[PDB]
Amino acid sequence: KRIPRKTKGKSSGANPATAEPGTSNCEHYKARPGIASVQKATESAELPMKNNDEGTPDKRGNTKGALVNEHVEARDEADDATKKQAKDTEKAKAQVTYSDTGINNANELSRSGNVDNEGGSNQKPMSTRIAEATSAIVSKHPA
Amino acid sequence: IMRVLDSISVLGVKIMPRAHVVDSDEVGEQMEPTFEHAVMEIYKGIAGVDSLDDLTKWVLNSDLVPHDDRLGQLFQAFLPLAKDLLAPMARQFYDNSMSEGRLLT
Incomplete structure (x- = not known):
């Protein structure tokens, strides 16, 4: 009765004859496109898009x-991506490429973990960046 | 055909008995790993396959017709074994067989 859960954090937070005229299981017809081939291609195309999870913050x-x-x-x-396409094609060089394009595309920016949301650079991680800022204010009991 | 040729006699001679004949597998059968076992362990070093059945699925499509690219890739791993692991032993065995009689191979 219980459906399982896929992604949980473990922390939890003399009989009438029944032979019927017309039913026979036999296969005389071969599918012209090919059921197995089309099913394999459909499975390959069925996959969801990759999770581009760059620049996204953490907990x-x-x-x-x-x-x-x-x-x-x-x-x-x-x-x-070009190398991955080459492997998918199984040749030394893929016919379709993303790097030999004659179009100049020097202004292209792709999301990376270099820049913070505020606009700065993660030379020091945000956690420590807050850590020294907070620890700059300390006060202990007098001697 | 070997069984049929064995039971052939016309005069007081035997034409081709179950002797004077070297089987094709007999050249590579007498090794600690056989050639068949040696080429069974070829899925190692090939990406995307982890077993012999997986290799057979990967190299043969649903039509049971060989995929040209994948089989051509697999031959590049098959050939070094057949050119280094088989050929010297085959040469030695063939020379030994030729020495001790004239046989059909």
Whole structure:
């Protein structure tokens, strides 16, 4: 009766003849497109889109990603996509590429973990950035 | 065909008995890993496969017709084994068989 749960944080917070005229199980027809092939292609296309989870904050508040410049991230990421397409095609060079395009695209920016939401750079994580700011105010009991 | 050729006699001779004949698997059967077992362990080093059945699924489509790209890729791993693990033993065995008689191979 209980349906399971997929994503939980573990922390929890002499009989009438029944032979019927006309029912026979046999296969005389082969599907022209191919049921297996079309089903495999549909399964491949069925997948949902990738979770682009860059620059998004954490529960603590630190932004996630790699400390790289935005345009460098865009270029390397397009190159990775081209390599992935090449592997999908199973050739040394993919016919369809995202890096040999003749169009100049130097202004392209892709989301990375370099920039905070406020507009600064995560040279120091936001948690520590708050930590020293708060610890700059201390007061102990007199000796 | 070997069984049929074994039971052939016309004069007081035997044409081709179950002897003087070397089977195709017999060249590679006498090794600690056989050639069949050696090529069974080929899914290692190939991305996306972890077992022999997975390899067979990956290299053969639903039509049971070989996929040209995948099989061509797999031959690049098959060939070094057949050119380094088989050939010297095959040469030695063939020379030994030729030495001790004239046989159909």
